[PDB]
Each structure stands twice: as structure tokens, then as C-alpha cells.
Amino acid sequence: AGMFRALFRQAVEDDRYGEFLDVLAEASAFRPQFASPEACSERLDPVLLAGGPTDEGRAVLVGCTGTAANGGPHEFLRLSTSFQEERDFLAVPLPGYGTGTALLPADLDTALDAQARAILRAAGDAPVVLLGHSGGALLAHELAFRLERAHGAPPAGIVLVDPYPPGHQEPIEVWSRQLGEGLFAGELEPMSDARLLAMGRYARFLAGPRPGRSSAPVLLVRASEPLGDWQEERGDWRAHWDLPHTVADVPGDHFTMMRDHAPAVAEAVLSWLDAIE
Amino acid sequence: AGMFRALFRQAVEDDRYGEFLDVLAEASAFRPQFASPEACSERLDPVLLAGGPTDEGRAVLVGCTGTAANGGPHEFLRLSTSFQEERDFLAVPLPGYGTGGTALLPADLDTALDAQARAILRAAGDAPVVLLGHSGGALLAHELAFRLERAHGAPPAGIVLVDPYPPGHQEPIEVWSRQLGEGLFAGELEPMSDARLLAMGRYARFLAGPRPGRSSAPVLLVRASEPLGDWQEERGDWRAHWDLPHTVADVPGDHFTMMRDHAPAVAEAVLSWLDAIEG
Ligand SMILES: *P(=O)(O)CC(=O)[C@H](C)[C@@H](O)[C@@H](C)C[C@@H](C)CO
Ligand SMILES: [Mg+2]
Secondary structure, rough: OOOOHHHHHHHHHHHOOHHHHHHEEEEEEEOOOOOHHHHOOOOOOOOOOOEEOOOOOOEEEEEEEOOOOOOOOOOHHHHHHHHOOOOOOEEEEEEOOOOOOOOOEHHHHHHHHHHHHHHHHHHHHOOOEEEEHHHHHHHHHHHHHHHHHHHHOOOOOEEEOOOOOOOOOOHHHHHHHHHHHHHOOOOOOOOOOOHHHHHHHHHHHOOOOOOOOOOEEEEEEEEEEOOOOOOHHOOOOOOOOOOEEEEEEOOOOOHHHOOHHHHHHHHHHHHHHHEEE | HHHHHHHHHHHOOOOOOHHHHHHHHHHHHHOOOOHHHHOOOOOOOOOEEEEOOOOOOOEEEEEEEEOOOOOOOOOHHHHOOOOOOOOEEEEEEEOOOOOOOOOOOOOOOOEEEEHHEEEEEEEOOOOEEEEEEEOHHHHHHHHHHHHHHOOOOOOEEEEEEEEEOOOOOHHHHHHHHHHHHHHHHHHHOOOOOOHHHHHHHHHHHHHHOOOOOOOOOOEEEEOOOOOOOOOHHHHHHOOOOOOOEEEEEEEEOOHHHHHHHHHHHHHHHHHHHHHHHHH
């Protein structure tokens, strides 16, 4: 396919996932970019994947697409089936992965602004609960903060499915080989070099210093099975967020929680939305 | 075609050639490699590009292929015609640039130099060897010369360094980086492949690192007479440099055209110098 995919495959084999991700971030510097939300080259209209009952003033769920180069439109499909007849579920695209190939955001705030504008158009008067998994969970919180700070519109809630935020990333660093193998095992087509570069750019965004914390309440959803090997004496390997409103534990590991066990995630979400409403 | 070439083009367009070279070097670490000279995936047999007169003990020229991703077997064709009827000229490939699946990259520079060394000794027989290289290839010519002396008990009779910019003197390289990157696209016969760009990055990194040994062979330093781009006089001298060369020759042209349009002048300097060192 592309040279970057070949290099990534070898990096994962040599257990140097983290090193290759840094290479992807540096290389992404030399891809054409958009520097203002207006200049975004793609249409970020959310897609409706599930319909709630008709019909009021009930929150709609917005799935925040994660950074995985093998991801995209498929990401929330299995999960969304469990929301049909319960809640509207909209998936918003992550800028820079589209289509000529899409312009990359110059910085994270620029991509978040683009997403915020598309979400606010789609949602209308309805309250919004943001949902993301893994790197998308980190992005869901960053979006939530930006909606609040810069768009006068804090979401009604955030659902963070297995987040590993800065300061709490040791297990995900220890398991980077499995993460890399999961990306390859989860391919439907070969990961494009353009999307690999997008993934590196966002990974770098998310390691950088961020402006603060959203006031929206948080549901922390955690996998119950470790993705790889872990010594008990090393501490808790589990996903982490500071002082969540509610915590839910679901079957599966970092990956299988969202497919195999997607109904369990959905059930935790539906219960929580009832509680906060 | 290939993402790396598109990225490279943008980097040059944006005056970030140096930064992009670093990225190529880091990326190249994830290419399949050869760790021993024997494990080299390519036939490094030198090509005879010019023949000396039929009339023992006379030095043969060996063209050390440079690092440019747009190079290869065509590199010494113009220069070599001027050696016809004067000296044998053999051109040795640089490991990591071939095809046939693409070529393995050297794990380290010494590994690539040993592969070349064995090919050269086999091809040259008993004849004394004079190594020749231009730019990146001039740096490689010296490193090979030192490796031949140290690891093969076979110091060359001489080294011809055409426009070298060694680690102590790379301000002109930095100041003209845009022109150097554009020169690389200008000199494309076909689109530089991603595999070759990664090779070029891997070698640039090799040539930045600690290389302690100095060849005992005498050096002819051949210098371009024209600046490749604008240069502020107070920066110092823009010309190519080598520490304590045996002889220095200035030729017409710039860094590129000295070989492109003025190769006969380069051959003439080499031939005069070879006569002087031989007797
Ligand atoms: P020359 O090969 O035209 C340019 C150089 O002398 C520079 C300093 C050298 O480091 C080479 C190895 C960089 C390559 C990218 C140019 O082929
Ligand atoms: Mg000196």
C-alpha cells in the first residue's frame, strides 16, 4: 500500500509503536493544513445512526470519532444499535481524515471549533451528551471544554469510554504493541498514509498542554479485562478520570468492550442519562 | 508518487528541507536492514564506465555513488567520458538504493562501506585505487577510504572530494537548503521513490554522526567557483572545505553545474593531480 503503513507494521512488530507515532506527528507537519474552522476542507455534518422515540428536550448523544487511522464511519455502528428507540445518536467526523485528501487541522482548537459548529447545527435545541472511546474519549472532553469556553454551550454530559489521560497512561504505554496490533487486526481496508499522518498529528495534540476542565458531568466507563500482561504490584491498570459523576464497569478489554460488549456500554449510558435528567 | 515525495516537496516549498531530512532519517529506522556485509541484498559490482589506454601499477578511479535519492547509475556518465583513454573508471553503487521488493538498508555506515569495499577490491585486482565522490558522495568517499585502510588493509592511493561540506562547515548547506532541495527535484529523471528518500535520510544521519578516523590517503579538493545562491559576505567563505588537503583545484560552475556543465574541468584537475602523485 503506502510506505507509512509498511513502516508502522514493522514498528509494531519491533515493539516501537510510540516511536513511530512520534515520526507520524513530525511528518504530518508537511501536509497541507487548515488554520481556521472556516478553512476546513470537509463537510462535518454528523450522521444519524440511531433514532430515539418521537417524542421532550431529551439529550441527544453525539459520538466523537476517535483518532485510529483504521476508523471512521464504522466506529459507532455496533454501539448505536442499542440506542435505536432510546436516543438519537449522531456520529461527528474528525477533521483531516476525509476524501485529493483532507486538510489537516493546524491545531486541536481549530478542529474542535469545526466540529462544534457542525454539532450545534445538527442538534438544534436539544441538549447534547458527547461520547468517545480511547483517544476519542480524550477528544470528547476537549470538545466539551471548547463548546463551554468558546461557544457558550457546555454539553449536558460527557461519556468517556476507557480514557487514558496524561499522567495515567502507563498501562496503555506498556500495552502499545497490542494497540498497534489492534489497529492492524481492525482493518477493513489498508490504513492510508494520509490517515496515519492524521492519527500522529492528533496524538501529538492530545499530549500537549490543554486549557482546562469542562464543568459537564462525566460518566466513566471502564473495561474489566486487561489488554495485556500486568503485575498486580504495579497498581491499577484500568482507565482513569478524576472524580467522575458515575463509574460503570463493563465486560471486555480496551477493544472488546466496544464490539463484543457494546450493549453493556449502551446500557450503562442509558441508565446514566435517566439519572442526570 | 508516494507520500514521502509529496511531503518532501512541501518541506522544500516551505523552506524546511533540513527538518524533513531528520524525519526521513527517523522513519528509515523501520525499513528492513542488513547487519552484515554478506547480508547485503544488492549486487554491488562496479560498472566500468571508461577505459584507460591498453599500455601496470597505474591507479584506477572509483566513483563513489552519492546519497541523492534521484541518483544512481547515471551519476558519473558525463564525468567518465573525460577519463576515456586516460584511466579506468569504475562506479560502485551505494547499498540501499536498488530494486528487484526493494533493497535492504545498512544497519550502520561501516556495514555499507564493508559491502562496497569487498566489491571494489574484487573488481580492481592489484591496481591502486583512487576514490572519487561529489557532495554527499565526497563525504562517503573519505569514510570508505578510512574503512579500506583500517578494516581491509587496503588504503587508497588518493581521494578526490568534489565540493565536500563536512560537519564543521555546513552553513552554506543550511543557507542554500531551499536551492539544494529544488536541485534534487530539478535533477529527477523519474519521481524519487519513498524507499530511496528513506535511504537518503538514513545516509545523511550516518554522515552527521561521530566518524573519528582520518584516512592516510592524500586528498584532492575540487571546489565550485560559483555560489549556488545568495550569500552574505560577512558570514565567511561559502566554498567547499576539507582539512589539510594535498591539493586544491577550483573549477567553473556551482555545486551542481560544476558536474553538470563543467565535468571536463573536474576530470582535467583529477588527471593533472594523478600524474603529480604517481611520478
Ligand atoms: P550534496 O550531496 O549535494 C549535499 C551535502 O553535501 C549534505 C551536507 C550531505 O549531508 C548529504 C548527505 C545530504 C543529502 C540529502 C544530499 O544528497
Ligand atoms: Mg584546515
